[PDB]
Design a protein around this ligand. Structure first.
Ligand SMILES: [Zn+2]
Lengths: 267, 90, 210, 165, 208
RNA sequence: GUGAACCGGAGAAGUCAUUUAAUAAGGCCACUGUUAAAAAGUAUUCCCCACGCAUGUGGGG
């Protein structure tokens, strides 16, 4: 598989238009752009310069994993995007009209990861602290109303006991499912605990005009909220046929919006 | 909605629409006469057709002949614009 | 009416005393390996790579007293509680229970009538390879600059002195010949008692209520 | 019209900094300097998107530059031919009057792009004779509908009516 | 009547000696009660910057006594207290959130018949090297320009006498082995007294 | 299919020669942008689908 690197300028003059920095405001925009970085054959031949209208059905729907972190390069702040996929990405076709998005040209390296039993890898990982509660619908109404009755099962953020710590709680949450994916954690240090926001358009059929031919479509924007937890540590390995499938896929839900990427450095 | 919330040339979230053929306006236009664009690219297109003397056939951003001038104007806008002035005027 | 109340506390943006250390790259894992528990990797370094920080607070006693409409002992309790809180609180979560590393390595309580910042001690960056003596040379630079300022901008009308805290470790006896140090303290509660004694003569263990 | 009145009110709402920004750009187009484009867009685009009969971009740009260099208070009944007629009937009719008449008559053979400089000359003549008022709205409408015949006929008729008092 | 009173003091716009790097402090307003139920972009933008400034004052000794109607002692007190305040006061703009009560690390006082501004020293931006800091390089370039002006536009009838202040001689007027000012001074009130007794025999005790 | 029908005002021509708009002017005197903020120790994450339903796990926008 391949790992790709994108560098975005975070500092610079703050009184100028910075479309590369503004692109990281919406994570759906990031996912859509990385999807546009995967042309589907005849799209390149029909549109080499990427000027015809964008169509999701004209691009491949292969999954990929990416992580957006931040760093300092000498005396400048930078945002690094690490893209892990299974097919060779084409960053030339994606940003060819948006060369000002990236401060530095993209990079790509072939990854051939395999580790037999006895490797103490150093890992970094940003998970989505999500859980499906059995009773997540109390219907806490607002205003004058405070308590009405309905029940449904929904995904919400992970919660911890008031007498415990978030670090230990997330450590045992990761260790509880850990033998299924094939690793043992020695140290688990919590580095961040926050949210990830985004917006998504959805077509809506307002009334048909004179021969509207399938209603009049109007965009309506719906929000997207995720609870993110970034953590590093040291982990061993066992059953490498399971760890390779763990590396190929992600960990936790919402894998298509920056979560689940496991970064491992051999030691 | 015909263009999936993407600017045509730079592929960014579109916030405005630019006409191509003007001989349908006043409330009779067709969706094929209009092209979706963002703020930077539409400002570049407006700059590129200020005093060009185009009556009915205006700039088509999907045309691959207008790509270089639009990109150069976009670079000029990125280099020289001041967000403070626009934020102060509105 | 005038809803605005004037602040009685000024806090500076806490700046480090050295350059910002870059984090560990993770794109290099596809091309090479640091080795078998070797450097640029499994070094240990206790737990992680810390960062020295210089923090600055400036509480004005008169504005604090006039804000509370009298009640001088309550303002003293507020000052002591704020000092104790600022000594041993992490800005983010993961609250310490009892580790003794959350204690600051140096406090300089001073009683001027004009606010002076010693942030210009670290205009020259504090570069070092060993992180054990990084704090020590940071205290050395701060000591040199505070000696320079306190005997350069010195006026005879209000010659004031202050206190200092350390874990009797980073040369607290031997910098600037203890001209400003006066009382050298190794205990947090004793330092709070000394500050409360200098301000009005109270003690920390006495007043804890309204 | 109402887009013209709102445009003139917005132009007179400006302060010295933006007037200097517009004043530095006389003799230039609109797609050249970013601050001028930003100021004119932020002054004109809401009015165009609201009123369908707002002045065109070239006419509005020309009036903006002329207001920048030749700031005159807006008053009704102080059109350009009327003031030119009032000034012209004070000079000798042998040398100076034919020259000023030729300067005024040059405007009929020019389109809207090549008309900033003769209008600047006419307004400089107006400013030299202690004038402090002008009708910006009527001039804007006349420039907006210029290639027609009745507008030029009314222009010359107003000039004759002011000249033969 | 003639309400216009001309001047006695000229102050130039203080400018940095290097390229400025403005920043944004992304602030947010955290609610106290859980139950906000608002997920969107509520981040804010507040701006700040850090720099090393060069200030330049100029007091005309005549035309200040003339405005004060011959009160030489009041003029001397005004000069001394202006020196004190300009040395130990900073603007009170967002000080409750940034708290930058920093003191100057060098003051150069000159006496001359025509005003000269050494702001042209920093036409070239002061790039920072690893061996030194910003203030030392700034003082070095200022000393370079001061010496070049001194040996340049130099007249025989008009002498120039200058002091040089630095706290405890931490930052001397660095220019090779050449000492520029006639009297290095390591204390503030001492230099105020020195300027005052150069002015014609005034002291910091009876004028107040 | 009518005081009407049928019906060329046609051929032809350099407005050429001569001309500084020149001599002069300081746009000058006065002005804080001030008061405010955790991107993080939470108690519902904006939607769809596989399973048996002890504040349940997996998959996709
Ligand atoms: Zn665009």
């Amino acid at each position: 598989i391949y790992l790709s690197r994108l560098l975005i300028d975070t500092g610079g003059n703050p009184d100028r238009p910075r479309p590369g920095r503004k692109w990281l405001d919406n994570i759906y925009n990031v996912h859509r752009r990385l999807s546009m970085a995967f042309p589907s054959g005849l799209r390149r031949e029909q549109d080499p310069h990427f000027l015809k209208p964008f169509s999701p059905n004209d691009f491949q729907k292969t999954p990929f994993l990416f992580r957006v972190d931040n760093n300092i390069d000498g005396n400048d702040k930078r945002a690094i995007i690490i893209v892990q996929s299974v097919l060779e990405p084409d960053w030339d076709y994606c940003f060819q009209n948006a060369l000002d998005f990236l401060a530095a040209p993209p990079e790509t390296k072939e990854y051939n990861p395999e580790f037999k039993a006895g490797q103490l890898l150093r890992f970094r990982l940003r998970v989505n602290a999500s859980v499906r509660r059995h009773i997540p619908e109390m219907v806490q109404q607002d205003g004058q109303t405070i308590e009405t009755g309905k029940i449904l099962h929904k995904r919400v953020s992970l919660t911890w006991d008031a007498s415990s710590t978030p670090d230990q709680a997330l450590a045992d949450w990761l260790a509880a499912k850990s033998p299924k994916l094939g690793f043992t954690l020695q140290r688990c240090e919590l580095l961040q605990l926050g949210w990830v926001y985004g917006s998504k358009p959805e077509p809506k059929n307002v009334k048909v005009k004179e021969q509207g031919q399938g209603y009049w479509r109007e965009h309506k924007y719906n929000p997207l909220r995720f609870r993110a937890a970034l953590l590093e540590g040291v982990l061993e390995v066992d059953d490498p046929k399971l760890f390779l499938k763990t590396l190929s896929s992600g960990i936790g839900k919402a894998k298509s919006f920056g979560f689940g990427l496991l970064s491992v450095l051999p030691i | 909605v015909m263009d999936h919330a993407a600017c045509m040339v730079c592929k960014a979230p579109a916030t405005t629409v630019q006409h191509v053929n003007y001989r349908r306006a006043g409330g009779k236009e067709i969706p094929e006469d209009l092209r979706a664009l963002c703020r930077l690219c539409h400002d570049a297109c407006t700059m590129l057709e200020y005093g060009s003397g185009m009556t009915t056939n205006r700039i088509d951003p999907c045309d691959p002949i207008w790509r270089e001038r639009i990109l150069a104007k976009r670079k000029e806008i990125v280099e020289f614009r001041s967000r403070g002035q626009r934020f102060r005027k509105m | 009416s005038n809803t605005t109340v004037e602040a009685a506390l000024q806090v500076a943006h806490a700046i480090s005393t050295h350059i910002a250390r870059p984090e560990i790259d993770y794109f290099v894992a596809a091309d090479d390996v640091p080795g078998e528990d070797a450097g640029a990797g499994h070094i240990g370094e206790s737990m992680f790579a810390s960062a020295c920080f210089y923090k600055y607070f400036s509480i004005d006693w008169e504005q604090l007293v006039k804000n509370l409409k009298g009640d001088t002992n309550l303002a003293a309790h507020t000052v002591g509680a704020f000092l104790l809180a600022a000594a041993k609180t992490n800005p983010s979560g993961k609250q310490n229970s009892f580790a003794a590393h959350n204690y600051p390595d140096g406090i300089l309580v001073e009683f001027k009538n004009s606010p002076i910042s010693y942030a210009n001690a670290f205009v020259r960056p504090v570069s070092v390879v060993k992180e054990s003596d990084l704090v020590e040379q940071s205290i050395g630079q701060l000591s040199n600059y505070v000696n320079d300022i306190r005997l350069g901008y010195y006026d005879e009308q209000s010659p004031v002195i202050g206190f200092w805290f350390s874990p009797n470790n980073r040369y607290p006896l031997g910098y600037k010949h203890s001209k400003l140090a006066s009382r050298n303290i190794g205990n947090l509660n004793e330092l709070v008692g000394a500050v409360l004694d200098y301000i009005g003569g109270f003690k920390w263990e006495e007043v804890q209520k309204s | 019209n109402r887009g013209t009145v709102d445009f003139i009110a917005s132009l007179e709402n400006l302060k010295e900094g933006d007037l200097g920004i517009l004043r530095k750009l006389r003799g230039a187009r609109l797609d050249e300097k970013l601050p001028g484009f930003d100021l004119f867009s932020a002054l004109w685009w809401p009015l165009r998107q609201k009123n369908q009969r707002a002045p065109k971009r070239e006419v509005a740009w020309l009036i903006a530059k002329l207001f920048a260099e030749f700031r005159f208070e807006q008053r009704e009944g102080a059109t350009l031919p009327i003031l030119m007629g009032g000034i012209c009937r004070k000079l000798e009719p042998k040398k100076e009057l034919p020259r000023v008449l030729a300067r005024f008559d040059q405007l009929a053979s020019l389109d809207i792009m090549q008309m900033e400089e003769p209008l600047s000359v006419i307004m400089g003549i107006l400013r030299k004779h202690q004038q402090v008022c002008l009708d910006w709205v009527g001039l804007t409408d006349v420039l907006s509908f210029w290639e027609q015949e009745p507008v030029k006929r009314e222009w010359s008729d107003s000039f004759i009516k002011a000249y033969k008092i």
